[PDB]
Design a protein around this ligand. Sequence first.
Ligand SMILES: CC(=O)SCCNC(=O)CCNC(=O)[C@H](O)C(C)(C)COP(=O)(O)OP(=O)(O)OC[C@H]1O[C@@H](n2cnc3c(N)ncnc32)[C@H](O)[C@@H]1OP(=O)(O)O
Ligand SMILES: CC(=O)SCCNC(=O)CCNC(=O)[C@H](O)C(C)(C)COP(=O)(O)OP(=O)(O)OC[C@H]1O[C@@H](n2cnc3c(N)ncnc32)[C@H](O)[C@@H]1OP(=O)(O)O
Lengths: 153, 153
Amino acid sequence: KDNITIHPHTAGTPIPYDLLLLADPSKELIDQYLTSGELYLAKYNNEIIGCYVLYPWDFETTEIKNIAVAEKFQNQGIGGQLLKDVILKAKNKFYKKLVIGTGNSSTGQLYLYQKYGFRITDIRKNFFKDNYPEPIWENGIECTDMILLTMEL
Amino acid sequence: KDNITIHPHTAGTPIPYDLLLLADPSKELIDQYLTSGELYLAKYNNEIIGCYVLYPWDFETTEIKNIAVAEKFQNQGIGGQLLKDVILKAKNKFYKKLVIGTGNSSTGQLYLYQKYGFRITDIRKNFFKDNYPEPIWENGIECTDMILLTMEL
Ligand SMILES: CC(=O)SCCNC(=O)CCNC(=O)[C@H](O)C(C)(C)COP(=O)(O)OP(=O)(O)OC[C@H]1O[C@@H](n2cnc3c(N)ncnc32)[C@H](O)[C@@H]1OP(=O)(O)O
Ligand SMILES: CC(=O)SCCNC(=O)CCNC(=O)[C@H](O)C(C)(C)COP(=O)(O)OP(=O)(O)OC[C@H]1O[C@@H](n2cnc3c(N)ncnc32)[C@H](O)[C@@H]1OP(=O)(O)O
């Protein structure tokens, strides 16, 4: 909606694993990019309803390692508001490219990221097969490969 | 449906440009891969309602350069029947890989081809921008790049 607020996560505050796990089934992988990344929390009427994690590769590129919206609040435009906020945060830290990777089966998400300016740029063959023990499925398609999209900032 | 027939196009028969143009807006590009490709026609109660073109790259790979279903008959499973038939024809000619390329904005099609066994393998940046004069748009996304998918036969 139009009355959502976004702030960085504060030390001592609970980490919204419920939300992060909607986007990444591995709590181990989440905690790893929380080490060097920056977590942001989207609040609406005092409740944390969404989040994203920015994860620098280097000076030029930073990656959205995780972006999630509470299941009760999806498909109301909150994700788009989050993506706009990520774009500003990455620009403010002088990154030149913003990257996000999603599953080959995530065809709905491939629309959304392109709507906000991401171009499809790379395929990571068997990324999910190699990095997650149990296979992952969407829409009856096995999610084996990562599709990487890139936005020039 | 279950009562569709598929046959190669016969010399002297009209070429269904109405159908081919649904899949490729350039009659010039269509006629070019009709030169070295093979056109197949799907008939239902005597009417041509779909078609595809197979276009060899070399001994190992052949490409679906064009696949189309009449607008009145779409989303009834005819395209899937066509894709199954292409797979058999390519195997029968001893190809090892079957390739199809669609637009970055064609997220519905990215589902369908993966459902029938195609993996996303390659991005052709600015393919449509370079090869078609007028820009092409889908779902409010500009169609600039070709997504190439590959099936091991
Ligand atoms: C790096 C990573 O984290 S990849 C994993 C991403 N996270 C997840 O998958 C976790 C689970 N899902 C979610 O948390 C969320 O659904 C998100 C983060 C993916 C998206 O957030 P949302 O608030 O649901 O998205 P939002 O409402 O802004 O837009 C979704 C869009 O999909 C569109 N859409 C609807 N049906 C379809 C469809 N069949 N195909 C494509 N797009 C569709 C909607 O219309 C909407 O677009 P629009 O606003 O232009 O009309
Ligand atoms: C190389 C080239 O030619 S690329 C260009 C391809 N051709 C074209 O775009 C021409 C215009 N379109 C067409 O001719 C046809 O629609 C084709 C050839 C793309 C597909 O043929 P169709 O008969 O419509 O497909 P079919 O009915 O078998 O299946 C379409 C699928 O999309 C699914 N679908 C529906 N909504 C969506 C959505 N939002 N996102 C993804 N998939 C969706 C349908 O459920 C169906 O899948 P299912 O059978 O597994 O449930």
